[PDB]
């Protein structure tokens, strides 16, 4: 129907916009702390701790199957990266403070971000 190609699209164009979110957080993270997933090869106790695992390369793969369906599920998983991170390790370590420091700078790129899904529709 011509009514699903029209959501279609629309998916499609949300796509765009939170590639264009995706790569601005990640940007926020220049040390590449979350690039990829706890290696559990290297954390094996990982999932006795953090029951969501999340990271901007698995964040990647579901944007790019247009998996995403509406901003809310985006920051979702944004803030499992952030969370994880929050509880598994301590406020004296790299990657806390990483973490905080995302949260803080991805904060402004997401309101503006709510803004133009509202905006365009």
């Known amino acids: 129907s ?18 264009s979110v995706l790569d601005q957080l990640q940007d926020k993270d220049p040390a ?3 690039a990829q997933p706890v290696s559990l090869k290297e954390v094996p106790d990982y ?3 953090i029951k969501h695992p999340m990271d901007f ?8 199957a247009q998996g995403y369906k509406n901003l809310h ?6 803030d499992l990266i952030i969370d994880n ?6 406020r004296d370590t790299v990657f806390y403070r990483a973490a905080v ?8 790129v997401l ?11």
Request: charged share 40%; glycine share 4%.
């Open 32 to 34: 590449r702390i979350f």
């Open 57 to 64: 390369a698995t964040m990647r793969k579901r944007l790019e």
């Open 101 to 108: 420091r995302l949260r803080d700078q991805g904060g402004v």
């Open 85 to 90: 991170c929050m509880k598994y390790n301590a």
């Open 2 to 19: 011509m009514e699903q190609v029209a959501m279609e699209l629309r998916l499609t164009e949300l796509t765009r916009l939170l590639r």
């Open 111 to 121: 309101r503006q971000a709510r803004r133009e899904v509202d905006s365009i529709g």
């Open 47 to 49: 999932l006795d701790h």
């Open 73 to 78: 599920e985006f920051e979702e998983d944004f």
